[PDB]
Design a binder for this molecule. Structure first.
Ligand SMILES: CCCCCCCCCCCCCCCCCC(=O)OC[C@H](COP(=O)([O-])OCC(O)COP(=O)([O-])OC[C@@H](COC(=O)CCCCCCCCCCCCCCCCC)OC(=O)CCCCCCCCCCCCCCCCC)OC(=O)CCCCCCCCCCCCCCCCC
Ligand SMILES: CCCCCCCCCCCCCCCCCC(=O)OC[C@H](COP(=O)([O-])OCC[N+](C)(C)C)OC(=O)CCCCCCCCCCCCCCCCC
Ligand SMILES: CCCCCCCCCCCCCCCCCC(=O)OC[C@H](COP(=O)([O-])OCC[N+](C)(C)C)OC(=O)CCCCCCCCCCCCCCCCC
Ligand SMILES: CCCCCCCCCCCCCCCCCC(=O)OC[C@H](COP(=O)(O)OCCN)OC(=O)CCCCCCCCCCCCCCCCC
Ligand SMILES: NC(=O)C1=CN([C@@H]2O[C@H](COP(=O)(O)OP(=O)(O)OC[C@H]3O[C@@H](n4cnc5c(N)ncnc54)[C@H](OP(=O)(O)O)[C@@H]3O)[C@@H](O)[C@H]2O)C=CC1
Ligand code: SF4
Ligand code: SF4
Ligand code: SF4
Ligand SMILES: [Zn+2]
Lengths: 342, 48, 178, 114, 47, 96, 52, 52, 207, 56, 156
């Protein structure tokens, strides 16, 4: 270890961790938690951003002086990546997107960009490269995002064979697109589900556990070159999950069945939004795709994390949707969701 | 200063710069010191 | 001695004239019309507003703003690492590390000032026995980053090499009063 | 061995006071998880109350116990009234403090601290 | 030339005299005047 | 002078520069490293020796109360030159 | 208040927090021409008190 | 040097916000009265104790 | 006559000493070690059982009308077994004189409140409690006054570190302000400044 | 001073005072910004005889 | 008639509005609030620049942390900031707010408001000359001049 990387201190905001990370995608739902957990134990975080400097403020405070170093980059410009990974010992590609744009395709974000980042990280002397694929990812899935993600992790491993690949499930938090989505269906007065939610399984995990797992894989020497499956402890059926949601939200739950060949058309329409669409055909298909069973893959308890069940961390997400009549309602008033094995 | 001008000194700048914050050509702080403690340089030969 | 502010009131004597005057005051709002007149007078006065950043507020040579390390006219640094400046700095903002320069002189390697800790008190420039550290006149040195406000030897030396034409004159003006 | 007593001339009366205080806290927890909109259950709060109480179970001087009860009543006042926000209440749970291990060997691997 | 002690001392004879007492002046009409004006205006308007 | 290192970073008058493998050079990415190009050692070397006809000379720097405390320097050793401890001015006994 | 801050600044260097009064007296004598300005300010301040 | 400078203390009768406001205004006026004297009679000499 | 030294009058010394004799012989049950200083200031030290009687006498008695409680302080001296030196500075408008009354306390040795005498002492006693840990009796509302709402410790105790034990920040994870153990980027620098040469031989402590 | 003999009358009547003689602005009635150099005095303890710090 | 040019001009307009109308919040903690006032005073007329102190956070656009931030006050500061609606900027005024300042090593001071909220501009001084605080306001104006949000949206 270089004399400036030896860890010193007790693991506080002003300590040293020995970690010099370059986090691609820090301006997202998960990147902010990752950067918080990194700057919390005194590590250097290099945060390349394409967005406006006004959208990195919430990050500017989650690290001591000099621990956060921001940079302007572009996915197409390869030098923008070399300059970022030029001094790191870790790289964390969280780049992703739940919809395609005028200028970017699922392929572009899930295959090429990770592949270039990995080429540069390898050529630059990086020791670790953490990639975040999906749990349900496969070259044989109906959704295009999952096919692209599987191809992308294949390429990342063909360019960086020691790349830690992390495969989480539908993540839930405050700024998420899963519980807030299943809560905001209410604006349409009813919940359209395929097969009435049955036949579908969801094993969701809290984002803080995922960030802890990433930050611990940063410095866990038994994790190099391994795949992980970050999944929650309990499996649910989409029906009972959404019912528990509307219970915490205390809204009226009117579920009706809906075949997928019209729900996907609905999703296309909604996706035509030139802004951030409220839903998409790919987000639809990603829903209603059952959740793979652990199938021997390592996990959070092997990284050093005890998963947090949804029944403890749902209200801090779903109290924002309640009305004045139900705000103060406690957690125990809501009947928990049925758990399954399948 | 057109009548009572300052005194001439080599080290004085000949081109004044404005506040250069949030740009390149700005100020980044660093340690002006050298290493205090030096590590042992392991040999390039094995014991055999 | 002392005086009364609201005891002036003496025993009550009232006439028809006094009653009518108080009545007009109460009915025509005399005393308020006078405040209206004052505010009117102020409307037709010249405002004290300066046109910043073109014309600026006055100052005096003694103004203590941004710090700078000076030099002798030969270019040699005035600091000798005596450390009075950090020994008295009541904010513990100064940090110094000295070492014999190759030529043997007593000079610094580190001279840092956390300008987020400085209270801009001036004790360092009145303690410096060589008039090396000063608190210059510049106050327009705000930043977009906290790190920029943690000055080191090079920053202060550059400031000194930037403001000397002004620092030296203000000193020449004020150094008899000290 | 002879001193002035604050309130209790023996440990049993101090224990009576401690029990009164435990009852007050046990009864209050629900009202303040409702009011402060805390995102915890009512059982976690009472477990935390019991833990903070046991934190000082080793005391035997009635004066220390009386002062601890005074401090606890001060806090219970600050909480019954909403003078303190959910921040100060969740300070008790230390949700962010990375828990230092009691394993000699881990303490050895990270740092020189005993 | 030479050099005597120089100091921001007041000028010989002292500074001018400073005003510090209240001078809220006295103005206005007589009261009877105000009421007469108002009453005459009312009467003319009524006519 | 301001010499550069194999990494391009400039070496300050303190001899400080980051090693090529040091991660602490990200702070200078898309930014600059502030150094003072006027090294006082070279400058005070560029000044000449002030001869004197007295064995003991004083040095207040210059400007009187604008310089440094007045120190007195012995100049017996004709091979060496006396250097002020505050400034770096050199003095030599003219007649030796 | 701004003019009196100017007095401060002239005599101390700071407008507001002048560490000027110190055990033994004051750090630094008055600068030439300050008492005149104080007189010019005091000869008029009464008028502003009257306005208020 | 108070006890070398003459001034009047303003005093209220009804302990209300009005009497206090008047007391403050008149204390400002008396501060002017005091500044006049401090200006006219300011002695020469040093400013800090002659004990180094 | 000398311009640097401070003019000293013995008349006030005599006045205050006579009044100290007065107080000592009129309250023998409580008074300890009356004393007067080179600077003219009267200091009456007492047993804490005498707080209320002493202060009430000094407020109500005719030759002593100290009916304005200027200050109320404490002083930690960890050496002595009773650390806290509680101080009552008082003022007589009728005689234009001041006086100071002192007691002593401990971590586990509380005293009585004087809000029945001087209502000005409510907040001052709350401050003493918050800062040093001294508990007062029969206080209407004794809580914290200056410290945070969940603050542990009494910061003015010499044994309490200047920088404390915790430190606050904002955590996006929980979306709250949290308290973490202290960790500084620059540690406070302790300067040993005491000269090793006796400076005032009038206060020399014989061995 | 820039006023013009009519606004002055108006505002003096409205306020009831002679403002033109007492202005909130400083027109060259102030000490300069470049004063000569001073020659400060010295205190009493600057003698060379009968000045022993044990006395004072 | 390129959409990129049109978007650049539209963003210029957006920023001009949000810039020439900056309504701060009546939030002053310590001495530095006095220089805030003085910057509201005739010599430096704030409204001259479009600046107006509104007392409700739900109406303000920026908050100047004008003094020392204690641990007993940080929750309220973060709450108020949270309650300010985006776009929201922050200005640290003085040395107490930037890094604790003269009270950095105290047990009841946060060593920088940048720990509790994110700061756009730092104004040094103890206290900062009102002229300096105005310099900082205009520095903020320019920073807003350089937001380029809609260009980013169009490039996405
Ligand atoms: C119009 C006349 C009323 C305004 C005026 O200034 O004259 C009244 C004149 C000025 O009074 P003042 O305040 O003592 O003059 C101030 C200095 O003399 C000011 O003197 P100065 O040396 O600073 O230079 C002043 C110069 C200013 O130079 C300019 O030309 C700028 C004018 C501002 C344009 C906006 O000239 C003027 O002020 C002429 C003012 C013309 C009116 C401008 C506003 C109308 C805008 C039209 C809307 C479209 O007073 C009178 O003669 C009686 C009042 C007349 C009642 C109407
Ligand atoms: C634009 C120019 C207009 C200027 C208006 C602002 C006032 C100017 C300053 C005057 C001032 O200083 O105070 C003067 C004086 C101040 O007086 P005083 O307070 O100094 O003493 C007055 C003495 N006694 C009590 C006897 C009256 O106030 C007035 O004169 C007010 C007059 C009455 C105003 C009537 C308002 C009602 C208008 C509608 C009714 C119309 C019918 C009129 C009936 C009468
Ligand atoms: C009588 C009242 C008169 C006053 C009303 C007159 C107002 C008319 C103003 C016309 C200007 C129109 C453009 C304003 C858009 C500003 C909205 C905005 O800033 O959002 C940025 C958004 C941001 O887009 P984004 O895709 O980059 O957001 C990414 C996600 N975040 C923000 C979290 C990082 O840009 C837009 O989408 C708006 C596109 C402009 C066209 C909209 C129609
Ligand atoms: C033969 C005749 C037959 C006809 C019959 C009629 C005869 C004429 C009678 C004239 C009567 C006078 C006109 C009545 C209006 C005034 C009413 C009034 O006097 O109210 C006074 C009220 C109390 O004042 P106060 O000092 O507190 O006394 C309290 C009692 N102890 O305080 C007030 O109400 C006033 C305070 C209001 C403050 C608000 C701000 C006022 C702003 C002043 C603006 C003035 C400009 C006017 C513009 C008008 C143009 C439309
Ligand atoms: N439900 C979830 O959140 C799940 C997440 N994951 C994985 O986690 C990762 C992040 O999730 P999340 O953070 O929620 O995604 P977000 O959309 O919340 O943020 C993703 C990041 O991708 C960056 N990004 C996307 N496209 C580009 C581009 N073309 N150029 C530059 N930057 C780009 C964005 O930067 P900007 O926003 O500034 O453009 C943003 O910071 C993704 O890779 C996803 O596959 C896995 C399973 C489920
Ligand atoms: S002005 Fe005062 S606080 Fe600032 S660096 Fe100098 S001595 Fe320290
Ligand atoms: S007081 Fe002056 S000479 Fe001494 S260490 Fe400080 S800057 Fe250098
Ligand atoms: S920085 Fe100085 S002026 Fe500003 S609040 Fe702190 S102590 Fe007061
Ligand atoms: Zn010299």
């Amino acid at each position: 270890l270089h004399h400036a990387v030896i860890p010193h201190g007790k693991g506080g905001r002003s300590s040293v961790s020995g970690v010099v990370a370059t986090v691609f995608g820090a301006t997202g739902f998960l990147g902010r938690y990752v950067v918080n957990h990194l700057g919390r134990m005194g590590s250097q975080v290099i945060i390349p951003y394409r967005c406006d400097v006004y959208d990195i403020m919430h990050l500017r405070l989650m690290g001591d002086l000099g621990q956060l170093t921001f940079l302007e980059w572009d996915a197409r410009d390869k030098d923008s990546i070399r300059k970022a990974v030029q001094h790191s010992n870790v790289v964390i590609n969280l780049i992703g997107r739940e919809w395609e744009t005028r200028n970017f395709d699922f392929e572009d974000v899930f295959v090429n960009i990770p592949r270039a980042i990995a080429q540069a990280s390898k050529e630059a002397g990086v020791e670790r490269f953490i990639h975040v694929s999906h749990l349900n990812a496969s070259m044989k899935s109906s959704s295009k995002s999952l096919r692209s993600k599987a191809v992308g992790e294949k390429e990342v491993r063909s360019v960086f064979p020691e790349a830690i690949i992390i495969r989480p499930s539908d993540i839930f938090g405050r700024e998420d697109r899963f519980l807030n989505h299943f809560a905001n269906y209410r604006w349409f007065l009813a919940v359209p589900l395929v097969s009435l939610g049955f036949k579908t399984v969801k094993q969701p995990v809290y984002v803080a556990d995922v960030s802890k797992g990433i930050v611990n894989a940063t410095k866990d020497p038994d994790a190099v070159g391994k795949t992980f499956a970050f999944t929650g402890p309990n499996r649910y059926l989409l029906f009972h999950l959404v019912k528990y949601i509307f219970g915490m939200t205390h809204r009226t739950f009117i579920p009706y069945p809906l075949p997928l060949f019209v729900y996907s058309w609905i999703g296309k329409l909604f996706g035509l939004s030139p802004f951030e669409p409220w839903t998409t055909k790919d987000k639809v298909e990603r829903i209603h795709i059952s959740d793979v069973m652990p199938t021997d893959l390592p996990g959070l308890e092997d990284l050093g994390v005890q998963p947090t069940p949804l029944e403890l961390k749902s209200i801090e997400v779903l109290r924002r949707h309640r009305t004045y009549r139900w705000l103060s309602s406690e957690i125990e008033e809501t009947k928990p969701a049925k758990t399954v094995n399948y | 200063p057109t009548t009572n001008p300052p005194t001439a000194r080599k080290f004085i700048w000949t081109n004044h710069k404005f506040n250069v914050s949030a740009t390149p050509e700005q100020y980044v702080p660093y340690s002006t010191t050298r290493k205090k403690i030096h590590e042992w340089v392991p040999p390039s030969t094995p014991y055999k | 001695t002392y005086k009364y502010v609201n005891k002036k009131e003496q025993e009550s004597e009232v006439d028809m004239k006094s009653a009518t005057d108080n009545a007009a005051r109460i009915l025509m709002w005399t005393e308020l019309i006078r405040g209206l007149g004052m505010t009117l007078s102020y409307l037709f006065r010249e405002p004290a507003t300066i046109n910043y950043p073109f014309e600026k507020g006055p100052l005096s040579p003694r103004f203590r703003g941004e710090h700078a390390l000076r030099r002798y006219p030969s270019g040699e640094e005035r600091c000798i690492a005596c450390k009075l400046c950090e020994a008295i700095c009541p904010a513990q903002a100064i940090t110094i590390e000295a070492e014999p320069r190759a030529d043997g002189s007593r000079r610094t390697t580190r001279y840092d000032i956390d300008m987020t800790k400085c209270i801009y008190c001036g004790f360092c420039q009145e303690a410096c026995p060589v008039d090396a550290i000063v608190e210059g006149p510049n106050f327009e040195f705000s930043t977009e980053t906290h790190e920029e406000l943690l000055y080191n030897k090079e920053k202060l030396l550059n400031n000194g090499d930037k403001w000397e034409a002004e620092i030296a004159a203000n000193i020449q003006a004020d150094y008899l009063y000290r | 061995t002879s001193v002035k007593p604050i309130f209790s001339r023996d440990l049993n009366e101090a224990k009576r006071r401690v029990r009164e205080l435990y009852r007050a806290w046990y009864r209050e927890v629900p009202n303040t998880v409702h009011l402060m909109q805390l995102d915890i259950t009512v059982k976690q709060g009472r477990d935390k109350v019991r833990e903070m109480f046991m934190k000082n179970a080793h005391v035997t001087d009635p004066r220390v116990v009386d002062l601890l009860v005074i401090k606890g009543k001060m806090e219970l006042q600050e909480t019954i009234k909403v003078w303190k926000q959910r921040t100060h209440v969740m300070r008790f749970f230390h949700e962010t403090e990375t828990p230092r291990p009691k394993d000699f060997l881990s303490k050895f691997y990270m740092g020189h601290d005993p | 030339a030479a050099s005597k002690v120089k100091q921001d001392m007041p000028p010989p004879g002292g500074y001018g005299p400073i005003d510090y007492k209240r001078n809220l002046p006295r103005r206005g009409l007589s009261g009877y005047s105000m009421f007469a004006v108002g009453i005459g205006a009312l009467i003319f308007g009524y006519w | 002078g301001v010499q550069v290192s194999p990494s391009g970073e400039k070496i300050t008058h303190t001899g400080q520069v980051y090693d090529e493998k040091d991660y602490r050079r990200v702070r200078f990415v898309d930014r600059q490293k502030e150094v003072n190009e006027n090294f006082a050692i070279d400058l005070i070397a560029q000044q000449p020796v002030n001869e004197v006809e007295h064995r003991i000379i004083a040095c207040d720097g210059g400007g009187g109360a604008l310089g440094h405390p007045k120190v007195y320097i012995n100049l017996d050793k004709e091979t060496k030159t006396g250097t002020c401890g505050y400034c770096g001015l050199q003095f030599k006994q003219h007649h030796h | 208040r701004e003019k009196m801050f100017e007095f401060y600044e002239r005599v101390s260097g700071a407008r507001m927090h002048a560490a000027y009064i110190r055990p033994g007296g004051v750090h630094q004598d008055l600068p030439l021409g300050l008492l005149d300005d104080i007189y010019e300010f005091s000869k008029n301040f009464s008028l502003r008190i009257d306005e208020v | 040097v108070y006890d070398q400078v003459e001034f009047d203390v303003p005093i209220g009768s009804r302990g209300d916000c009005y009497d206090r406001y008047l007391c403050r205004v008149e204390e400002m006026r008396q501060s002017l009265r005091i500044i006049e004297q401090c200006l006219n009679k300011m002695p020469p000499g040093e400013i800090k104790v002659d004990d180094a | 006559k000398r311009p640097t030294v401070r003019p000293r009058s013995d008349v006030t010394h005599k006045q205050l000493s006579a009044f100290g004799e007065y107080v000592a012989e009129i309250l023998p049950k409580y008074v300890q070690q009356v004393q007067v200083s080179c600077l003219d200031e009267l200091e009456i030290c007492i047993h804490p059982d005498g707080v209320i009687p002493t202060l009430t006498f000094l407020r109500d008695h005719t030759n002593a009308q100290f009916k304005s409680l200027a200050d109320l302080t404490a002083v930690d001296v960890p050496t002595r077994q009773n650390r806290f030196e509680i101080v009552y500075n008082l003022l007589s408008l009728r005689f234009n004189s001041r006086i100071r009354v002192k007691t002593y306390a401990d971590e586990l040795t509380p005293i009585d409140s004087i809000v029945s005498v001087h209502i000005a002492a409510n907040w001052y006693e709350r401050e003493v409690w918050d800062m040093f840990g001294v508990f007062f009796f029969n206080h209407p509302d004794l809580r914290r006054i200056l410290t945070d709402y969940g603050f542990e410790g009494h910061p003015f105790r010499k044994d309490f570190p200047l920088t404390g034990y915790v430190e606050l920040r904002y955590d996006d994870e929980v979306k709250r302000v949290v308290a973490e153990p202290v960790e500084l980027a620059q540690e406070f620098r302790k300067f040993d400044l005491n000269s090793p040469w006796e400076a005032f031989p009038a206060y020399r402590q014989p061995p | 001073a820039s006023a013009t003999r009519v606004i002055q009358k108006l505002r003096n009547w409205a306020s009831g005072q002679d403002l033109q003689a007492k202005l909130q602005l400083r027109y060259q009635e102030i000490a300069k910004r470049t004063q000569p150099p001073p020659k400060l005095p010295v205190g009493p303890s600057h003698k060379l005889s009968n000045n022993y710090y044990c006395t004072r | 008639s390129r959409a990129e040019y049109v978007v650049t001009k539209l963003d210029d307009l957006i920023n001009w509005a949000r810039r020439s109308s900056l309504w701060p919040m009546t939030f002053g903690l310590a001495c530095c609030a006095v220089e805030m006032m003085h910057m509201a005073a005739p010599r430096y007329d704030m409204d001259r620049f479009g600046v107006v102190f509104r007392a409700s956070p739900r109406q303000a656009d920026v908050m100047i942390v004008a003094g020392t931030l204690t641990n007993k006050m940080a929750p309220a500061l973060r709450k108020v900031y949270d309650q300010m609606p985006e776009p929201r900027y922050v200005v640290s005024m003085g040395s107490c707010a930037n890094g604790g300042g003269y009270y950095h090593y105290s047990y009841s001071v946060v060593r920088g408001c940048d720990r509790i909220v994110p700061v756009d501009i730092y104004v040094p001084g103890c206290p900062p000359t009102a002229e300096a605080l105005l310099y900082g306001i205009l520095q903020l104006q320019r920073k807003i001049k350089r937001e380029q949000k809609l260009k980013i949206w169009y490039r996405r």
